[PDB]
Amino acid sequence: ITGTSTVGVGRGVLGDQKNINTTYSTYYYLQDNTRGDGIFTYDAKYRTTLPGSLWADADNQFFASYDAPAVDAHYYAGVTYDYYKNVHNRLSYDGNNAAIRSSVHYSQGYNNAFWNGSEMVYGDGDGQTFIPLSGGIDVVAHELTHAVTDYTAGLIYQNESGAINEAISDIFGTLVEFYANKNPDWEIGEDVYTPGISGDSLRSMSDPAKYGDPDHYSKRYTGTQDNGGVHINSGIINKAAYLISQGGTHYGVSVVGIGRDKLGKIFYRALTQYLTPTSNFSQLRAAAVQSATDLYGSTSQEVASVKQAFDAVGVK
Ligand SMILES: [Ca+2]
Ligand SMILES: [Ca+2]
Ligand SMILES: [Ca+2]
Ligand SMILES: [Ca+2]
Ligand SMILES: [Ca+2]
Ligand SMILES: [Ca+2]
Ligand SMILES: [Zn+2]
């Protein structure tokens, strides 16, 4: 829309009030002109045609139950944009301020969210396994990170390359959650998963085995389900990232932690300079070692800790 930038107010999926950047031209649209070439949020109206209609509102107030997933998709896309710009000097997912588009209310009872090659897409959940998935800042940032990966390393979404793809999205989703600094943790999807059960999540980076995922290369899945286990074997890499940041001893191997900020620098460099569409876990180790060497020096603690972390998860 061509109009004037405005600031609306609404409530997200978890019932929290937030301001959102909108545009006015007869209606107020979920179009944020303050970031890049815009952030645009669409209504898929419980159908699967995409993107659907650019979200329009008569009064710039977004407090209806139907509005909540749009409010959060739109707001958390802005947070994720800010993280990549402020922390990594990256302008949108293509590095040239590409428009960021999301659709909410996708299908009926849809227990998932995804990047479809052109935009983010969020289901409302069935109210039992999930509530609307855009309520999770880690979920929104996970999806937008798939766009970043597709424009950079382009990790093929199958087998070991696909597991790295998934782990990169869990890592940056978590780092974005810590950047926004509201109830941050190393779990994925806890804000929107199983409303009737407290304390669980979809996956854990700190303890992948908690939710049945491998935390060592010896326990990797090698069958064909889930594109050869992309959301399963991501646990091996998620654990290595957790260890690089936080430290710990895992199967007897001790890792000196170096903190989230350096974890983010090392993985962002690996993703944008060293990883390729066919990279496997061993090649990820080399890419992370080279990135840490570039940033901190071959004799640094940071390099030593990357090696320790990959050793701890059985990746040579
Ligand atoms: Ca309204
Ligand atoms: Ca959290
Ligand atoms: Ca989380
Ligand atoms: Ca739950
Ligand atoms: Ca599981
Ligand atoms: Ca090829
Ligand atoms: Zn993913």
Side-chain angles (χ1 to χ4, degrees):
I1 266 57
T2 307
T4 188
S5 307
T6 48
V7 181
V9 61
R11 245 186 304 265
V13 176
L14 273 27
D16 56 318
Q17 181 167 310
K18 51 200 80 181
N19 294 337
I20 47 265
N21 296 112
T22 56
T23 296
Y24 173 77
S25 185
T26 305
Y27 285 96
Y28 294 88
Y29 296 86
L30 291 183
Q31 171 179 315
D32 170 6
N33 306 124
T34 69
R35 293 172 173 108
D37 292 309
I39 299 183
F40 304 80
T41 300
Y42 292 80
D43 189 2
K45 310 178 187 182
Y46 305 139
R47 296 188 69 99
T48 58
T49 297
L50 293 172
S53 296
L54 185 64
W55 191 287
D57 184 89
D59 69 2
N60 215 18
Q61 291 189 65
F62 296 82
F63 296 100
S65 302
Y66 195 78
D67 300 335
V71 165
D72 279 343
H74 194 61
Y75 184 90
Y76 295 142
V79 174
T80 307
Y81 177 97
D82 290 352
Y83 169 79
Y84 277 108
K85 179 177 186 279
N86 294 329
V87 177
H88 297 298
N89 192 215
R90 191 182 188 81
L91 302 173
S92 199
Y93 55 87
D94 72 338
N96 195 218
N97 273 150
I100 291 168
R101 300 179 290 282
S102 308
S103 298
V104 301
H105 295 306
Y106 177 80
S107 197
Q108 296 193 23
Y110 192 78
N111 286 320
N112 222 330
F114 59 98
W115 168 259
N116 77 344
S118 309
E119 63 165 288
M120 296 177 276
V121 186
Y122 303 89
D124 289 329
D126 58 16
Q128 176 193 344
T129 295
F130 279 106
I131 66 178
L133 275 89
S134 65
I137 186 177
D138 50 5
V139 173
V140 172
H142 175 115
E143 303 312 336
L144 193 46
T145 301
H146 278 308
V148 173
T149 298
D150 284 4
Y151 271 89
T152 57
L155 293 153
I156 292 153
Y157 201 69
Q158 180 97 17
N159 299 331
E160 285 187 20
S161 67
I164 294 167
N165 187 318
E166 271 300 307
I168 292 291
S169 281
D170 286 344
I171 292 164
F172 288 98
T174 292
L175 292 179
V176 172
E177 190 172 302
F178 274 96
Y179 173 79
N181 197 34
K182 172 152 180 48
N183 302 310
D185 47 57
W186 290 88
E187 312 282 278
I188 304 286
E190 71 284 345
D191 289 331
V192 293
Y193 190 63
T194 58
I197 300 165
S198 79
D200 63 345
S201 60
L202 203 47
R203 286 183 290 283
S204 178
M205 300 180 70
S206 58
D207 185 13
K210 183 147 82 157
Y211 302 112
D213 299 324
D215 53 11
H216 191 277
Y217 195 67
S218 72
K219 303 191 174 186
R220 71 190 177 281
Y221 175 70
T222 54
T224 67
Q225 292 164 212
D226 186 34
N227 295 120
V230 300
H231 294 98
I232 297 168
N233 294 322
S234 55
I236 292 151
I237 301 312
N238 286 165
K239 181 74 180 179
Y242 174 75
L243 287 171
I244 289 171
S245 184
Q246 301 303 114
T249 303
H250 184 53
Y251 297 102
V253 179
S254 293
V255 185
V256 177
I258 65 180
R260 286 170 322 257
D261 287 1
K262 300 183 176 166
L263 173 70
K265 288 269 214 152
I266 288 160
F267 274 66
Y268 181 79
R269 195 169 179 86
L271 180 70
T272 57
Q273 300 297 316
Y274 293 109
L275 295 172
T276 70
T278 60
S279 291
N280 61 31
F281 283 10
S282 185
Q283 293 172 317
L284 169 67
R285 178 193 173 117
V289 172
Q290 181 64 234
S291 297
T293 300
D294 290 346
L295 286 160
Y296 309 111
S298 57
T299 68
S300 67
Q301 179 64 247
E302 294 83 349
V303 175
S305 291
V306 173
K307 294 174 171 165
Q308 289 160 354
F310 284 93
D311 283 354
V313 301
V315 174
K316 302 304 298 189

PDB file of all heavy atoms in Angstrom, residues 13-36:
ATOM      1  N   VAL A  13      -0.661 -13.345  21.001  1.00  0.00           N
ATOM      2  CA  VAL A  13      -1.213 -14.663  21.328  1.00  0.00           C
ATOM      3  C   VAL A  13      -1.174 -14.997  22.810  1.00  0.00           C
ATOM      4  O   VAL A  13      -2.081 -15.644  23.340  1.00  0.00           O
ATOM      5  CB  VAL A  13      -0.423 -15.750  20.481  1.00  0.00           C
ATOM      6  CG1 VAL A  13      -0.877 -17.166  20.848  1.00  0.00           C
ATOM      7  CG2 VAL A  13      -0.639 -15.476  18.998  1.00  0.00           C
ATOM      8  N   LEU A  14      -0.151 -14.535  23.499  1.00  0.00           N
ATOM      9  CA  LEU A  14      -0.022 -14.761  24.937  1.00  0.00           C
ATOM     10  C   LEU A  14      -0.709 -13.673  25.776  1.00  0.00           C
ATOM     11  O   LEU A  14      -0.640 -13.700  27.007  1.00  0.00           O
ATOM     12  CB  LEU A  14       1.460 -14.853  25.293  1.00  0.00           C
ATOM     13  CG  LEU A  14       2.275 -16.172  25.224  1.00  0.00           C
ATOM     14  CD1 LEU A  14       1.784 -17.184  24.236  1.00  0.00           C
ATOM     15  CD2 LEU A  14       3.728 -15.844  24.965  1.00  0.00           C
ATOM     16  N   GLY A  15      -1.412 -12.755  25.120  1.00  0.00           N
ATOM     17  CA  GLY A  15      -2.199 -11.740  25.818  1.00  0.00           C
ATOM     18  C   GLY A  15      -1.419 -10.483  26.204  1.00  0.00           C
ATOM     19  O   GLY A  15      -1.900  -9.649  26.956  1.00  0.00           O
ATOM     20  N   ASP A  16      -0.217 -10.333  25.687  1.00  0.00           N
ATOM     21  CA  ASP A  16       0.594  -9.154  25.989  1.00  0.00           C
ATOM     22  C   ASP A  16       0.329  -7.994  25.004  1.00  0.00           C
ATOM     23  O   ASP A  16       0.152  -8.231  23.827  1.00  0.00           O
ATOM     24  CB  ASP A  16       2.048  -9.561  25.978  1.00  0.00           C
ATOM     25  CG  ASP A  16       2.478 -10.226  24.645  1.00  0.00           C
ATOM     26  OD1 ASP A  16       1.747 -11.096  24.014  1.00  0.00           O
ATOM     27  OD2 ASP A  16       3.599  -9.857  24.229  1.00  0.00           O
ATOM     28  N   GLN A  17       0.263  -6.770  25.512  1.00  0.00           N
ATOM     29  CA  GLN A  17       0.011  -5.605  24.670  1.00  0.00           C
ATOM     30  C   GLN A  17       1.313  -5.135  24.005  1.00  0.00           C
ATOM     31  O   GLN A  17       2.366  -5.079  24.633  1.00  0.00           O
ATOM     32  CB  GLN A  17      -0.617  -4.475  25.516  1.00  0.00           C
ATOM     33  CG  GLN A  17      -0.946  -3.225  24.704  1.00  0.00           C
ATOM     34  CD  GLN A  17      -1.850  -2.257  25.462  1.00  0.00           C
ATOM     35  OE1 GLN A  17      -2.891  -2.644  26.005  1.00  0.00           O
ATOM     36  NE2 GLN A  17      -1.442  -0.992  25.510  1.00  0.00           N
ATOM     37  N   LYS A  18       1.263  -4.828  22.720  1.00  0.00           N
ATOM     38  CA  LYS A  18       2.446  -4.273  22.063  1.00  0.00           C
ATOM     39  C   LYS A  18       2.047  -3.221  21.014  1.00  0.00           C
ATOM     40  O   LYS A  18       0.911  -3.225  20.501  1.00  0.00           O
ATOM     41  CB  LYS A  18       3.327  -5.381  21.448  1.00  0.00           C
ATOM     42  CG  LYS A  18       2.627  -6.382  20.560  1.00  0.00           C
ATOM     43  CD  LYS A  18       3.472  -7.706  20.406  1.00  0.00           C
ATOM     44  CE  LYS A  18       3.309  -8.648  21.606  1.00  0.00           C
ATOM     45  NZ  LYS A  18       4.145  -9.910  21.434  1.00  0.00           N
ATOM     46  N   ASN A  19       2.971  -2.319  20.729  1.00  0.00           N
ATOM     47  CA  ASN A  19       2.782  -1.410  19.587  1.00  0.00           C
ATOM     48  C   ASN A  19       3.266  -2.051  18.303  1.00  0.00           C
ATOM     49  O   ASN A  19       4.229  -2.821  18.319  1.00  0.00           O
ATOM     50  CB  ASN A  19       3.528  -0.115  19.826  1.00  0.00           C
ATOM     51  CG  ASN A  19       2.951   0.689  20.995  1.00  0.00           C
ATOM     52  OD1 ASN A  19       1.780   0.539  21.389  1.00  0.00           O
ATOM     53  ND2 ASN A  19       3.780   1.521  21.566  1.00  0.00           N
ATOM     54  N   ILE A  20       2.613  -1.760  17.177  1.00  0.00           N
ATOM     55  CA  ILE A  20       3.039  -2.325  15.910  1.00  0.00           C
ATOM     56  C   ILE A  20       3.043  -1.231  14.833  1.00  0.00           C
ATOM     57  O   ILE A  20       2.191  -0.343  14.838  1.00  0.00           O
ATOM     58  CB  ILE A  20       2.115  -3.490  15.401  1.00  0.00           C
ATOM     59  CG1 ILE A  20       0.622  -3.132  15.498  1.00  0.00           C
ATOM     60  CG2 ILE A  20       2.406  -4.812  16.169  1.00  0.00           C
ATOM     61  CD1 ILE A  20      -0.084  -3.617  16.780  1.00  0.00           C
ATOM     62  N   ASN A  21       3.985  -1.329  13.912  1.00  0.00           N
ATOM     63  CA  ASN A  21       4.093  -0.378  12.819  1.00  0.00           C
ATOM     64  C   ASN A  21       3.110  -0.723  11.721  1.00  0.00           C
ATOM     65  O   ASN A  21       3.127  -1.835  11.177  1.00  0.00           O
ATOM     66  CB  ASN A  21       5.535  -0.360  12.293  1.00  0.00           C
ATOM     67  CG  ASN A  21       6.512   0.139  13.324  1.00  0.00           C
ATOM     68  OD1 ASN A  21       7.348  -0.614  13.831  1.00  0.00           O
ATOM     69  ND2 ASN A  21       6.425   1.406  13.641  1.00  0.00           N
ATOM     70  N   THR A  22       2.245   0.242  11.400  1.00  0.00           N
ATOM     71  CA  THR A  22       1.208   0.011  10.391  1.00  0.00           C
ATOM     72  C   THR A  22       1.285   1.087   9.288  1.00  0.00           C
ATOM     73  O   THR A  22       2.186   1.938   9.312  1.00  0.00           O
ATOM     74  CB  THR A  22      -0.204  -0.025  11.049  1.00  0.00           C
ATOM     75  OG1 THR A  22      -0.434   1.182  11.775  1.00  0.00           O
ATOM     76  CG2 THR A  22      -0.301  -1.178  12.024  1.00  0.00           C
ATOM     77  N   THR A  23       0.399   1.002   8.293  1.00  0.00           N
ATOM     78  CA  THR A  23       0.345   2.021   7.245  1.00  0.00           C
ATOM     79  C   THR A  23      -1.121   2.387   7.049  1.00  0.00           C
ATOM     80  O   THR A  23      -1.975   1.498   6.982  1.00  0.00           O
ATOM     81  CB  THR A  23       0.905   1.453   5.882  1.00  0.00           C
ATOM     82  OG1 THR A  23       2.299   1.119   6.027  1.00  0.00           O
ATOM     83  CG2 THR A  23       0.785   2.487   4.742  1.00  0.00           C
ATOM     84  N   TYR A  24      -1.397   3.670   6.884  1.00  0.00           N
ATOM     85  CA  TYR A  24      -2.782   4.099   6.723  1.00  0.00           C
ATOM     86  C   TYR A  24      -3.053   4.579   5.296  1.00  0.00           C
ATOM     87  O   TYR A  24      -2.340   5.453   4.791  1.00  0.00           O
ATOM     88  CB  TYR A  24      -3.087   5.245   7.671  1.00  0.00           C
ATOM     89  CG  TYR A  24      -4.456   5.802   7.409  1.00  0.00           C
ATOM     90  CD1 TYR A  24      -5.598   5.131   7.863  1.00  0.00           C
ATOM     91  CD2 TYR A  24      -4.612   7.003   6.683  1.00  0.00           C
ATOM     92  CE1 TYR A  24      -6.874   5.632   7.599  1.00  0.00           C
ATOM     93  CE2 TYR A  24      -5.916   7.521   6.419  1.00  0.00           C
ATOM     94  CZ  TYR A  24      -7.018   6.825   6.891  1.00  0.00           C
ATOM     95  OH  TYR A  24      -8.294   7.286   6.653  1.00  0.00           O
ATOM     96  N   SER A  25      -4.127   4.036   4.695  1.00  0.00           N
ATOM     97  CA  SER A  25      -4.685   4.529   3.441  1.00  0.00           C
ATOM     98  C   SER A  25      -6.086   3.936   3.380  1.00  0.00           C
ATOM     99  O   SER A  25      -6.264   2.790   2.965  1.00  0.00           O
ATOM    100  CB  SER A  25      -3.868   4.088   2.221  1.00  0.00           C
ATOM    101  OG  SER A  25      -4.421   4.700   1.050  1.00  0.00           O
ATOM    102  N   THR A  26      -7.048   4.712   3.877  1.00  0.00           N
ATOM    103  CA  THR A  26      -8.434   4.277   4.087  1.00  0.00           C
ATOM    104  C   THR A  26      -8.566   3.295   5.261  1.00  0.00           C
ATOM    105  O   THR A  26      -9.328   3.541   6.192  1.00  0.00           O
ATOM    106  CB  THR A  26      -9.043   3.693   2.779  1.00  0.00           C
ATOM    107  OG1 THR A  26      -8.919   4.669   1.729  1.00  0.00           O
ATOM    108  CG2 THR A  26     -10.501   3.402   2.993  1.00  0.00           C
ATOM    109  N   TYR A  27      -7.854   2.162   5.182  1.00  0.00           N
ATOM    110  CA  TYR A  27      -7.696   1.252   6.322  1.00  0.00           C
ATOM    111  C   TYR A  27      -6.289   1.345   6.884  1.00  0.00           C
ATOM    112  O   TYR A  27      -5.414   1.911   6.240  1.00  0.00           O
ATOM    113  CB  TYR A  27      -7.866  -0.205   5.863  1.00  0.00           C
ATOM    114  CG  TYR A  27      -9.299  -0.603   5.589  1.00  0.00           C
ATOM    115  CD1 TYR A  27      -9.818  -0.567   4.291  1.00  0.00           C
ATOM    116  CD2 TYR A  27     -10.118  -1.051   6.627  1.00  0.00           C
ATOM    117  CE1 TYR A  27     -11.163  -0.954   4.043  1.00  0.00           C
ATOM    118  CE2 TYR A  27     -11.446  -1.411   6.404  1.00  0.00           C
ATOM    119  CZ  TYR A  27     -11.957  -1.364   5.101  1.00  0.00           C
ATOM    120  OH  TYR A  27     -13.279  -1.755   4.886  1.00  0.00           O
ATOM    121  N   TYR A  28      -6.066   0.700   8.028  1.00  0.00           N
ATOM    122  CA  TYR A  28      -4.727   0.585   8.593  1.00  0.00           C
ATOM    123  C   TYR A  28      -4.259  -0.813   8.248  1.00  0.00           C
ATOM    124  O   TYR A  28      -4.949  -1.777   8.574  1.00  0.00           O
ATOM    125  CB  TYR A  28      -4.771   0.706  10.099  1.00  0.00           C
ATOM    126  CG  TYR A  28      -5.195   2.099  10.528  1.00  0.00           C
ATOM    127  CD1 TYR A  28      -6.535   2.416  10.679  1.00  0.00           C
ATOM    128  CD2 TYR A  28      -4.240   3.090  10.749  1.00  0.00           C
ATOM    129  CE1 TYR A  28      -6.955   3.715  11.059  1.00  0.00           C
ATOM    130  CE2 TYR A  28      -4.655   4.416  11.125  1.00  0.00           C
ATOM    131  CZ  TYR A  28      -6.001   4.700  11.266  1.00  0.00           C
ATOM    132  OH  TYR A  28      -6.389   5.984  11.636  1.00  0.00           O
ATOM    133  N   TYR A  29      -3.121  -0.923   7.579  1.00  0.00           N
ATOM    134  CA  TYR A  29      -2.625  -2.231   7.197  1.00  0.00           C
ATOM    135  C   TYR A  29      -1.422  -2.662   8.023  1.00  0.00           C
ATOM    136  O   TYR A  29      -0.635  -1.815   8.436  1.00  0.00           O
ATOM    137  CB  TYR A  29      -2.175  -2.217   5.738  1.00  0.00           C
ATOM    138  CG  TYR A  29      -3.310  -1.949   4.807  1.00  0.00           C
ATOM    139  CD1 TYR A  29      -3.676  -0.647   4.518  1.00  0.00           C
ATOM    140  CD2 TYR A  29      -4.036  -3.007   4.233  1.00  0.00           C
ATOM    141  CE1 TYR A  29      -4.730  -0.361   3.665  1.00  0.00           C
ATOM    142  CE2 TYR A  29      -5.111  -2.736   3.349  1.00  0.00           C
ATOM    143  CZ  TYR A  29      -5.433  -1.408   3.090  1.00  0.00           C
ATOM    144  OH  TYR A  29      -6.471  -1.087   2.249  1.00  0.00           O
ATOM    145  N   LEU A  30      -1.234  -3.974   8.153  1.00  0.00           N
ATOM    146  CA  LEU A  30      -0.015  -4.493   8.784  1.00  0.00           C
ATOM    147  C   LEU A  30       1.094  -4.428   7.773  1.00  0.00           C
ATOM    148  O   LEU A  30       1.494  -5.427   7.158  1.00  0.00           O
ATOM    149  CB  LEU A  30      -0.251  -5.918   9.315  1.00  0.00           C
ATOM    150  CG  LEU A  30      -1.203  -5.944  10.521  1.00  0.00           C
ATOM    151  CD1 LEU A  30      -1.321  -7.414  11.030  1.00  0.00           C
ATOM    152  CD2 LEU A  30      -0.786  -5.031  11.723  1.00  0.00           C
ATOM    153  N   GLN A  31       1.612  -3.215   7.597  1.00  0.00           N
ATOM    154  CA  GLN A  31       2.722  -2.970   6.717  1.00  0.00           C
ATOM    155  C   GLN A  31       3.640  -1.993   7.489  1.00  0.00           C
ATOM    156  O   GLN A  31       3.253  -0.855   7.797  1.00  0.00           O
ATOM    157  CB  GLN A  31       2.229  -2.305   5.419  1.00  0.00           C
ATOM    158  CG  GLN A  31       3.351  -1.821   4.513  1.00  0.00           C
ATOM    159  CD  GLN A  31       2.798  -1.181   3.227  1.00  0.00           C
ATOM    160  OE1 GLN A  31       1.892  -1.727   2.624  1.00  0.00           O
ATOM    161  NE2 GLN A  31       3.336  -0.026   2.833  1.00  0.00           N
ATOM    162  N   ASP A  32       4.826  -2.484   7.836  1.00  0.00           N
ATOM    163  CA  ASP A  32       5.791  -1.736   8.631  1.00  0.00           C
ATOM    164  C   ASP A  32       6.813  -1.163   7.656  1.00  0.00           C
ATOM    165  O   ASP A  32       7.556  -1.907   7.037  1.00  0.00           O
ATOM    166  CB  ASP A  32       6.413  -2.738   9.657  1.00  0.00           C
ATOM    167  CG  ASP A  32       7.626  -2.171  10.421  1.00  0.00           C
ATOM    168  OD1 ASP A  32       7.981  -0.972  10.302  1.00  0.00           O
ATOM    169  OD2 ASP A  32       8.264  -2.954  11.184  1.00  0.00           O
ATOM    170  N   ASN A  33       6.814   0.161   7.482  1.00  0.00           N
ATOM    171  CA  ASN A  33       7.728   0.815   6.553  1.00  0.00           C
ATOM    172  C   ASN A  33       9.050   1.211   7.186  1.00  0.00           C
ATOM    173  O   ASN A  33       9.903   1.838   6.513  1.00  0.00           O
ATOM    174  CB  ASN A  33       7.071   2.085   6.035  1.00  0.00           C
ATOM    175  CG  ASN A  33       5.710   1.817   5.451  1.00  0.00           C
ATOM    176  OD1 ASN A  33       4.713   2.416   5.868  1.00  0.00           O
ATOM    177  ND2 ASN A  33       5.652   0.904   4.498  1.00  0.00           N
ATOM    178  N   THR A  34       9.202   0.935   8.484  1.00  0.00           N
ATOM    179  CA  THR A  34      10.359   1.483   9.222  1.00  0.00           C
ATOM    180  C   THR A  34      11.565   0.583   9.074  1.00  0.00           C
ATOM    181  O   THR A  34      12.661   0.936   9.510  1.00  0.00           O
ATOM    182  CB  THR A  34      10.059   1.651  10.745  1.00  0.00           C
ATOM    183  OG1 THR A  34       9.946   0.354  11.347  1.00  0.00           O
ATOM    184  CG2 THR A  34       8.735   2.466  10.971  1.00  0.00           C
ATOM    185  N   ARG A  35      11.360  -0.630   8.553  1.00  0.00           N
ATOM    186  CA  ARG A  35      12.447  -1.605   8.423  1.00  0.00           C
ATOM    187  C   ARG A  35      12.605  -2.065   6.950  1.00  0.00           C
ATOM    188  O   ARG A  35      11.704  -2.703   6.390  1.00  0.00           O
ATOM    189  CB  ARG A  35      12.171  -2.830   9.310  1.00  0.00           C
ATOM    190  CG  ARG A  35      12.212  -2.502  10.796  1.00  0.00           C
ATOM    191  CD  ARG A  35      11.743  -3.676  11.609  1.00  0.00           C
ATOM    192  NE  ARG A  35      11.932  -3.431  13.052  1.00  0.00           N
ATOM    193  CZ  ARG A  35      10.959  -3.184  13.923  1.00  0.00           C
ATOM    194  NH1 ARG A  35       9.674  -3.071  13.529  1.00  0.00           N
ATOM    195  NH2 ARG A  35      11.270  -3.038  15.208  1.00  0.00           N
ATOM    196  N   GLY A  36      13.759  -1.784   6.354  1.00  0.00           N
ATOM    197  CA  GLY A  36      14.061  -2.338   5.032  1.00  0.00           C
ATOM    198  C   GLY A  36      13.061  -1.862   3.990  1.00  0.00           C
ATOM    199  O   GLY A  36      12.655  -0.698   3.998  1.00  0.00           O
TER     200      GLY A  36
END
